[PDB]
Amino acid sequence: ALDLGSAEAKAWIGVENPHRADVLTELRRSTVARVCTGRAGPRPRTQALLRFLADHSRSKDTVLKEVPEEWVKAQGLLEVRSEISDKNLYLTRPDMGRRLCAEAVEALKAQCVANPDVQVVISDGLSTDAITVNYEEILPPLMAGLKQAGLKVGTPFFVRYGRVKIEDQIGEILGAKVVILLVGERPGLGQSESLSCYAVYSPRMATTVEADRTCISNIHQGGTPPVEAAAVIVDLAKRMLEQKASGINMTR
Amino acid sequence: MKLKTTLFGNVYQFKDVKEVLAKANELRSGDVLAGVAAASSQERVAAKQVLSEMTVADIRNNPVIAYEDDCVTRLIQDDVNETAYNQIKNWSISELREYVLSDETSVDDIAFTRKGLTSEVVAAVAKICSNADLIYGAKKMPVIKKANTTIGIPGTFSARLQPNDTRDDVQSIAAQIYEGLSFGVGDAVIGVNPVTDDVENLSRVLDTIYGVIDKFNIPTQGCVLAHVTTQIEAIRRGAPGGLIFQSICGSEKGLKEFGVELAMLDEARAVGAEFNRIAGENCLYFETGQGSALSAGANFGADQVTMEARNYGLARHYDPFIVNTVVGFIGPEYLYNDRQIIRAGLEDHFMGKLSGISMGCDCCYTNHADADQNLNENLMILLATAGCNYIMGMPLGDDIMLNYQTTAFHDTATVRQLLNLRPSPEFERWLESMGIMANGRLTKRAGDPSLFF
Amino acid sequence: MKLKTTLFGNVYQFKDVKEVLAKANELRSGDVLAGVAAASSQERVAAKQVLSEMTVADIRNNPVIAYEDDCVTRLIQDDVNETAYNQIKNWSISELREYVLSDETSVDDIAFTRKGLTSEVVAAVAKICSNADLIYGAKKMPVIKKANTTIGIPGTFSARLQPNDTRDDVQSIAAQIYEGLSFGVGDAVIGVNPVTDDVENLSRVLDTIYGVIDKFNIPTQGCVLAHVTTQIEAIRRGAPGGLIFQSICGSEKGLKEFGVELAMLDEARAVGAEFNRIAGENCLYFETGQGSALSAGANFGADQVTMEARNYGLARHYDPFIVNTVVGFIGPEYLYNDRQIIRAGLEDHFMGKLSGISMGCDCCYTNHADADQNLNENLMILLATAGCNYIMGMPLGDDIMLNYQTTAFHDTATVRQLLNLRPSPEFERWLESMGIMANGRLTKRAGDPSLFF
Amino acid sequence: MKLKTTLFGNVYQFKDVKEVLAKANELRSGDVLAGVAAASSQERVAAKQVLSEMTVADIRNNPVIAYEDDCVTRLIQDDVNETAYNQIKNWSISELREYVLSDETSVDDIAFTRKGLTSEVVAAVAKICSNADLIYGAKKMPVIKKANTTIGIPGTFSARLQPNDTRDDVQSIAAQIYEGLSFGVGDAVIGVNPVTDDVENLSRVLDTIYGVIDKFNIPTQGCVLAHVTTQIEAIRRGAPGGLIFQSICGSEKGLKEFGVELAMLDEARAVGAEFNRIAGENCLYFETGQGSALSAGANFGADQVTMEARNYGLARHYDPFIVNTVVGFIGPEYLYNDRQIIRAGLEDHFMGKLSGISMGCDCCYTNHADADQNLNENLMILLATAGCNYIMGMPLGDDIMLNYQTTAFHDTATVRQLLNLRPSPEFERWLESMGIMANGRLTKRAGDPSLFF
């Protein structure tokens, strides 16, 4: 018997009568992609199809799950939300995910520091796992990087049901020179803890385009390590203040 | 022009062309989100009838974004062969539909007629077509282009090898390439979406791709799907140039969202002519898909099908080697489920072929959409019957970085053997040399990446 | 036996084979209604894995209804080739799936292998097949039968002309016959579902069908789809016999619901041999479809896919000319939407071809189901690529009397010309003589019923 | 660089690349007149050997007219694919000759290789090729273009109908059109050199040509071979646009002599896109020929072969539908006799195909040159075996107005039937419909212009 979520199932070679079987093991080890599973005619092998379907069922559950209200409060974060009420509405209304609710605007003016040089924002986005697994690894060295040998640092807060464009409203309300958003990307098939960073210099609701942002993607243990990514984002934040530009407007 | 009709005794009034075009669309979540969808099935049909009774002139002279306000509109309108336009300007969209579908209308007849069309007219035909209309109509409109391989020949079916990795690791990229080639995938392009949009990184990814291409003398082309500016820069610095890619949008504001100027695409052509290792005359590559304009706040009250057709009008100007819609790439907010994704894919491909571009489709869905892999398999086969130029190929269809599911390497092989389709003739020849393919079918040793070692 | 697996650390326990079979199914409305569906997507996959690891022997020895209580089970079990069975009994269902799909497995290999199968085993293989598996698998399993036409030859595609009327009016039936023939429809059969189940009316309808057949010397066969007993009587009393029809069910209880004994099907065989105007050796015609057993209270805690497979095991014994599932004939209660209808249609066809019957499909939906005509066009094309022996044909697909929508006459012509498929060779020759067809294509004068006048 | 060789113990010294290019030519009248010809047969061979040992880089870096002084040189140099150039720059001209002629060198290999060439390099290769080298080399380099007909497909052979008249009389033009079509001539173009270079007359001649085209639905294109500026004006003012013509020269001085700027050819491209009745993507038409630059005082001490090659480098930029040399159009002063005309014709065609243009040839001579009609028949057949895209057609080859003899309508039919070559596929189908052609052969009723009445 075999568990389709186990390590042995993921490392399974299905290629029948290989030309060079030690190459197949070296190929399977070099990538996380579903390689070397073989075939039945032009169709996938049964076990590969089963493992695919098993990982899909887990991926389906991982998208509509919510970060508990207690977990964010335990991290010492302010929880604020967009215009969106729940998970179901979040998936169909991106325009409401791009705007803070009326009570969110007032809370940010009340409880956050004004005119920061670098503002860090965290949101669940499309994957709760992305911010849950990576948080303790990425957020502390980011703060100890921006403050230590640095400048004016804003207070970190959690946006529930947020979309990338919401950082433009966050930048205007707080008067932030640089807005950093750590957000969960849409979940993959067999991997769902992938975080992205979206950064923009002095954003405006009516002028900032998507190309004005710098993206640091695939932040996880299987991608760019959160600790290693934290020093990249700090350096990016420093370069954005120095150039007074972000995204496509930056040098090199 | 008439902007109303009576249906079952009830009068159905519409305010402008843009509204009629929008409400005639089959139901999709994106049109409801844009607030432009029909209120019911009755209003939808009435909109289809109003649309069908309108002339080519009515729709050509009413583009969704005005000529003076949009460079894409200017691009589309100024490319019109006005003699071809004058022949068909008084035709109803109903008459244009029937003309496209007619067995007495040859490939050469359509070649001239399509030159008198604008993207809005292209979309208008698609809106009054059933699923089989879109499939059969596309099939009788082949578009053939040539890089180092020839794509689009009836009886052929190509595939993009998409060897993506979370870290752009060159060992992981190579392994997926060898796996793909073993199934006969890669005649469209070997195209990587890079993690870091960096000149040094692009060169390393390209050298890995071309390390495999050169070692086995593979008739194909490599591509790295970063921003067009960094592709140009890397190629200028001496990185190998195959296809040059850019994501496009159907409006000026949409292109500004992507950080694209029309001058960059012209520059891409010039850089390609000076630097690229392409035997044929086509070297550009665009990707498209419904919802992108609405995402950019750049649809201007127009539905996503009309905006998507405007992409093809823009693409046509640059005569690219390949274009594909990435049909379910974004999410349920623009295309919710199986039904809507299939319809969109059939629409996109039909409109692409009517616009006269080398049109393929990334048959795909996301994990937050109401869909599964059976949708991809349904759509790829339907589109292959429509003469879809190419689909994607990934190991089992799982993108480990872009976090979505496309078609497997298996699927291309399946489609080819199911429908008696061949790859690009140049690539097929190479597959036969390698012992991977015989008579269009995978040999016993095929599907095994160790064959290259 | 293992009725257990662990998935993601969670143990999933199943009671019996019947539950494993039921829960392994893709989600559908009927299985939920039956209370046999999976509770979660993870449990569905668990059931799929458990089923895949089970052997042929495990499934063969555990039919859903017992041998001693069910004459259909008895007939299925007694028809097994034991030598074939003994070669494959220790194979897992996973291994049998891979065997069917393999390109090293020839048509003749499956010819012998399928004789060691039962319907439950046929169903089990289908449950662990993706949509493209069902399509490709069915395609490499052609089944050829012959009446006055030959059906099922690869590269061909047939169609039933269904000229139904609200009052069995002969002018209305004839009008639809001339319309269908003008599109090249009717090589499978010209089959009427009658309003009144009596001898004189059946004799009148048959005389109308055969009035057309005789006047134009059409290589085809007629059928009136009444109860088998009334057809037999009409034929014995002098009505022209073509195909003899009966709706079948997968259980003895189900057959009793329809009022059929196995002796009637034996009688139909004998009556056909004595009376019918059939050149070839096949003359029976069955129709099937998921949900009918559950409607009869005759599924006995089993899922509708397995019960539908038992229909094919039953049909096989009587070596009919044609069988078709009527995929979405009943309502949303058994198959809810586009997705479920497409899936069921692919399942039904695959299972029929695996069972060795001349399997076609009525691509259809009802008006109270979540579907439209675009669904019919999606499914018909997919099934055509799977080598579906035949579909229906009605004017625009509107049955004015059975109150549902099937495929249009247009759809058969579309599928043929889209996929380069021909009609039945005998019927094709007739169409060429009539000036309706040239090189597989409709001529200019085709699609016009006044051509016969 | 080596500008020296020793032959039979005798040292031969050359001043520059321009002299090496000039003296390597086979003996012709124009080169002697230019004072650039070899003094002896030994010096000719010496120049051939010196040229053969020179590299691609040597010839590319030394065009006959400087980059800064000549817009044609600039256009040629700037169109080069540098990646292609860098692969072949260290190759000797001898190695490039062997590369072109090699059977291991495919059509796609030359497709990329030719992009790294300049016209001087094209000319250099031609100078060290024998007559059979020019024929075989050109044959393995097909160039395919499409207007309303496709030209240049191997196994095909096209023809320009040239219905010229002394007064531009419409009855005389039409008479010759019906005669030419009856022999299957006119798939390249129906092209008239007009007497009067004005708008109304051009509009009248075009209406006459298109009167015939429209009445019989002929897949072809019309052209009036006036100055490009007058054609553009006629077309903008409503005259039917087919092909737009311009005579070209290999230098800026030469273009000024003809009164052409490169912007006019750009304008013609744009005017064609807006107005012309052309289904395909090619609509320009150039004519060339050795001696024209020397006539203009615009050869700058260079030989007529190299200057003629520069015409093709210029033409290539504008991707025309057709180009032809008018081999012996001028007089004995540039090409004296049979030998020199045949040689020039083979050179011109080979160089055009190497340059990647749709190269044909007007096989012709003047009455003051040492030639006759047997020369035209020798050359036309040789060029046809080289895969010449097209020749001219006139009644018996007598131009009653341009005062020279070209090939007869008969000659196209002869070449086709002699070599089993077909017309353009679109035009061939038209001829079959008209009962003029059957299986590539003229029918009994062909060759008779009264067939159209």
Ligand code: COY
């Ligand atoms: C979905 C997606 C998109 C889509 C946007 C989402 C939407 N329209 O709602 C889409 C299709 C428009 C798209 C386009 C592009 C364009 C332009 C982006 C722009 N400037 O607007 C793009 C430049 C491609 C090109 N060469 O032109 C592009 C790129 C390169 C990238 C890469 C960034 C590299 C980098 N380090 O800078 C990237 C990491 C993928 C990769 N190549 O590895 C990714 C972020 C790559 C991402 C991969 C990944 N692993 O994350 C991925 C897969 C998911 C992002 C996510 O989950 N975000 C979280 C989510 C909660 O945010 P959201 O608010 O809902 O959505 C926002 C963000 O996604 C943001 N955003 C998305 N991409 C992107 C890129 C940059 C540089 C920035 C600053 C911001 C970007 O835009 C929206 C604003 O509402 C993604 N994208 Co885009 C991947 C390109 C896909 C291939 C072509 N393609 C596919 N479909 C279509 C189509 N319909 N039309 C035309 N082309 C395509 N993307 N993308 N994208």
